[PDB]
């Protein structure tokens, strides 16, 4: 029961978000209206104030004498789906006959899309994203020929037992999803949902996952977001004995059903590490090109 005036008239509890701005449809570019000369005092749209933090709103009709143009240029191609729903390389898995990298005929690839610059720069324009995915597996030998080999792909969600050998019991896949495909077949293609415990993937995370003393050994925890750890992708050659051909696998990802929040500046330095925004300190280069003088071209 509320009886005091400061509780009766209180504004605590307002859960609705006051929005100063609203979305308006814009299928084409904006038209241009006819304008004429103006010779008067007190009304000046040319002069602004950039200190406020707002973009200047002087238009064509207020500065020069213009004609009427019926602009019909579509804005459909700059949408998030149109920009992001294109496939690109995100990971490579190598299965050599002899070597030290994957000598046993199986490999585990932790799923993260910050391994290649073309995709990473595009995806890191934003801070949060929520989307669906489409993965494609193109397999060939180092000389590029296609050979009669049978492979198995397995999706291992976090918490599941990771395979340790080509004859491991985890390959019974009683619950894990798996794909059996031949190299002579077209590439395998599967659709993956949004799997985060949160409402969006965040590519930047200013924090640590656990409490405690932050010493030297417990320093890599910075920027490590547990919510972007989506498990492992495991590959192997089906058989009890060793395979006959060395194989290379390239994974291509295509986004769809995209939503994004909080844009941020684009990267202008070379990447060095995964999930780590470090940059070469002694080799800083400008964003753009340079010229001899400011008064010449």
């Amino acid at each position: 029961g509320d009886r005091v005036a400061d509780v009766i008239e209180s504004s605590i509890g307002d859960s609705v978000s006051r929005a100063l701005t609203r979305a308006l449809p814009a299928p084409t570019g904006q038209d241009t209206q006819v304008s004429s000369h103006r010779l008067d005092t007190g009304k000046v749209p040319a002069l602004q104030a950039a200190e406020i933090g707002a973009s200047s709103n002087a238009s064509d009709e207020s500065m020069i004498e213009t004609r009427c143009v019926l602009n019909s240029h579509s804005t459909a191609e700059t949408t998030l789906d149109s920009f992001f729903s294109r496939a690109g390389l995100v990971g490579e898995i190598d299965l050599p006959l002899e070597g030290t990298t994957n000598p046993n005929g199986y490999a585990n690839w932790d799923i993260d899309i910050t391994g290649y610059a073309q995709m990473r720069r595009k995806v890191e324009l934003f801070t949060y994203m929520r989307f669906d995915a489409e993965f494609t597996f193109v397999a060939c030998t180092p000389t590029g020929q296609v050979v009669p080999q049978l492979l198995q792909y397995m999706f291992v969600p976090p918490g599941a037992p990771e395979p340790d050998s080509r004859e491991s019991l985890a390959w019974q896949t009683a619950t894990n999803p798996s794909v059996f495909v031949k190299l002579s077949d077209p590439p395998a293609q599967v659709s993956v949902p949004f799997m985060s415990p949160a409402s969006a993937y965040q590519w930047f995370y200013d924090g640590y996952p656990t409490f405690g003393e932050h010493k030297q050994e417990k320093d890599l925890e910075y920027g490590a977001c547990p919510n972007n750890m989506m498990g492992t992708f495991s590959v192997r050659t089906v058989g009890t004995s060793k395979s006959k051909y060395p194989l290379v696998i390239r994974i291509y990802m295509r986004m769809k059903h995209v939503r994004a929040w909080i844009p941020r500046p684009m990267r202008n330095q070379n990447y060095l590490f995964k999930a780590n925004p470090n940059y070469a300190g002694n080799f800083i280069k400008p964003t753009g090109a340079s010229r001899t003088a400011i008064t010449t071209l």
């Binding site: 929005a19 965040q202 910075y222 925004p277 070469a280």
Partner: protein, 245 residues
């Protein structure tokens, strides 16, 4: 008018006579969490007037060769007053902020400041100069506290991202010719309804001088910069004993 303003909240008041309007972060006011978005079951606390007040943290000196500074939120307040006590005693946290930056000079001084708010401002390292070393920023650099920290490479903002595009973030300019203060109102920015106030930092505040300070010999050489800020619509949950860090 527009150049004069007075901000009052709780038991504190800020007056100014050289304002430049007020910027509302992403066109949204701070608000409480709704019943359809909340996920925890216990009743959160809303202390109201004892935490929603203006806190003045510290003062920095602006020189002719200064590079810039940054502050992390709410790390600046995790140890100040009743707000700090509540943030230490509770597991969850949710609030917005109202930032006011003070910097005044005479009519014969010149210079410009860019005040911006960048969410999830992860600080990168120089990676050992050559770039073959896998280093991570130390504690005094990632979480400097209420004393702030100075930029080493302001052209890249210590993250490899150009400062020329920092204006896409909510921002204001402090140009000594025109104004002497800046105000940015930030709603709650996160992908979770509630988050830890000690492990996680929501955003970072950047103050970088784009135009160098300059004056003639004889004028006052000590030009300070001050940061004042007030939490808005604060909630806390998951009460247990206090933890230092």
């Amino acid at each position: 008018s527009d150049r004069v303003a007075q901000l009052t909240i709780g038991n504190s008041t800020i007056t100014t006579q050289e304002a430049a309007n007020i910027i509302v972060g992403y066109g949204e006011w701070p608000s409480y969490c709704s019943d359809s978005d909340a996920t925890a079951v216990d009743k959160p606390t809303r202390p109201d007037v004892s935490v929603n007040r203006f806190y003045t943290l510290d003062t920095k000196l602006w020189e002719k060769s200064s590079k810039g500074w940054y502050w992390k939120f709410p790390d600046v307040l995790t140890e100040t007053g009743v707000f700090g006590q509540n943030a230490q005693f509770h597991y969850l946290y949710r609030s917005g902020f109202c930032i006011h930056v003070q910097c005044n000079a005479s009519k014969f001084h010149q210079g410009a400041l860019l005040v911006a708010v960048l969410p999830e401002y992860v600080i990168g390292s120089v990676a050992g100069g050559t770039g073959t070393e896998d280093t991570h920023p130390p504690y005094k650099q990632t979480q400097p506290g209420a004393d702030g920290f100075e930029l080493q490479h302001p052209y890249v903002l210590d993250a490899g991202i150009p400062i020329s595009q920092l204006t896409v973030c909510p921002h204001q300019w402090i140009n000594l010719r025109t104004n002497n203060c800046a105000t940015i109102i930030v709603p709650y920015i996160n992908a979770l309804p509630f988050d830890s106030a000690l492990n996680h930092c929501n955003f970072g505040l950047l103050v970088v001088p784009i135009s160098p300070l300059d004056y003639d010999q004889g004028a006052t050489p000590v030009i300070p910069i001050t940061i004042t800020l007030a939490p808005m619509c604060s909630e806390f949950a998951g009460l247990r004993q206090a933890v230092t860090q």
